[PDB]
Design an enzyme around this catalytic site. Structure first.
Site: not given
Ligand SMILES: *[C@@H](CC(=O)OCC)[C@H](C[C@@H]1CCNC1=O)NC(=O)[C@@H](CC(=O)[C@@H](NC(=O)c1cc(C)on1)C(C)C)Cc1ccc(F)cc1
Length: 180
Positions: A71, A145, A147
């Site tokens: 990732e 936000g 990431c």
């Molecule tokens: C960051 C993305 C961002 O800032 O984008 C700007 C446009 C974000 C952080 C998380 C949002 C909620 N809490 C966070 O910290 N990342 C994402 O949204 C990814 C999706 C997720 O993190 C999902 N979480 C899980 O799948 C999960 C799994 C476990 C064990 O714990 N949580 C939730 C939103 C459902 C985006 C993403 C990343 C990687 C991928 F392969 C697919 C999608």
């Protein structure tokens, strides 16, 4: 306090807001014109770096030996500015790290330092249905936000934030051998 100063220094010199069709992400400049973003940032032919449309010469999505995604996407930017070499701060191997911090830039009112507590090498997880390898876990309520956020400790660039579930946060591990 040296660790917090280290954190602001790392944002000044090595951080930037990478903008793509998926939204804005914290980019981490590693050396020369190489920067890393979450792979889900999904960088195209051109991205905006701190608002400046920039052409990306090459895009390398990082994967472990068994074909699973890390990732992490390494971007080679077409631009004059060179980033300070932070590679010496990157760990060579997986490990756990007590009392870590998260350096945020994109989607934030300003560079922000958040303390996420203890971090553990957590293995593979399923992010939005996708298997992802080399995950650092922490018990912090990270938000959307965040990431691209740089997980760190004084003199140590550990990883970049990629996901979470309201309870925990997960970062893609940064290893020195990836930036060779
Ligand atoms: C960051 C993305 C961002 O800032 O984008 C700007 C446009 C974000 C952080 C998380 C949002 C909620 N809490 C966070 O910290 N990342 C994402 O949204 C990814 C999706 C997720 O993190 C999902 N979480 C899980 O799948 C999960 C799994 C476990 C064990 O714990 N949580 C939730 C939103 C459902 C985006 C993403 C990343 C990687 C991928 F392969 C697919 C999608």
């Amino acid at each position: 306090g040296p660790e917090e100063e280290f954190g602001m220094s790392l944002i000044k010199h090595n951080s930037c807001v990478i903008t793509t069709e998926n939204g804005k992400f914290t980019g981490l400049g590693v050396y020369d014109r190489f920067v890393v973003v979450p792979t889900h940032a999904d960088p195209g032919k051109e991205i905006q770096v701190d608002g400046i449309t920039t052409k990306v010469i090459d895009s390398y999505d990082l994967y472990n030996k068994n074909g699973i995604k890390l990732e992490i996407t390494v971007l080679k930017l077409d631009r004059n500015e060179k980033f300070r070499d932070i590679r010496r701060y990157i760990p060579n191997n997986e490990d756990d790290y007590p009392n870590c911090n998260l350096a945020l830039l994109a989607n934030q009112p300003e560079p922000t330092i958040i303390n996420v507590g203890d971090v553990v090498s957590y293995g593979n997880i399923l992010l939005s249905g996708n298997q992802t390898a080399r995950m650092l876990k922490y018990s912090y309520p990270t938000k959307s936000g965040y990431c691209g956020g740089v997980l760190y400790k004084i003199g140590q660039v550990l990883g970049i934030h990629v996901g979470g579930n309201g309870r925990d946060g997960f970062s893609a591990m940064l290893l020195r051998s990836y930036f060779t």
